[PDB]
C-alpha cells in the first residue's frame, strides 16, 4: 500500500479468485516455456 488514492481494494469476488489461480497456472506454464 505505497500510495493508491481513489478506487479502494476491499471485498474479494469468486470471479476474480478463480482468475487469480487460473493466471498462476498459465503463468507457471509461461515461466516454463520451451527455452532449451
Curated annotation (Swiss-Prot):
Functional note: Hormone secreted by pancreatic cells that acts as a regulator of pancreatic and gastrointestinal functions probably by signaling through the G protein-coupled receptor NPY4R2.
Lineage: superkingdom: Eukaryota
Modified residues (Tyrosine amide): 36
Protein name, per record: Pancreatic polypeptide
Span covered, complete protein: 30 to 65 of 95
Gene: PPY
Amino acid at each position: 500500500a505505497p500510495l493508491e488514492p481513489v478506487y479502494p481494494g476491499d471485498n474479494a469476488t469468486p470471479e476474480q479468485m478463480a482468475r487469480y489461480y487460473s493466471a498462476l497456472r498459465r503463468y507457471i506454464n509461461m515461466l516454463t516455456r520451451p527455452r532449451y
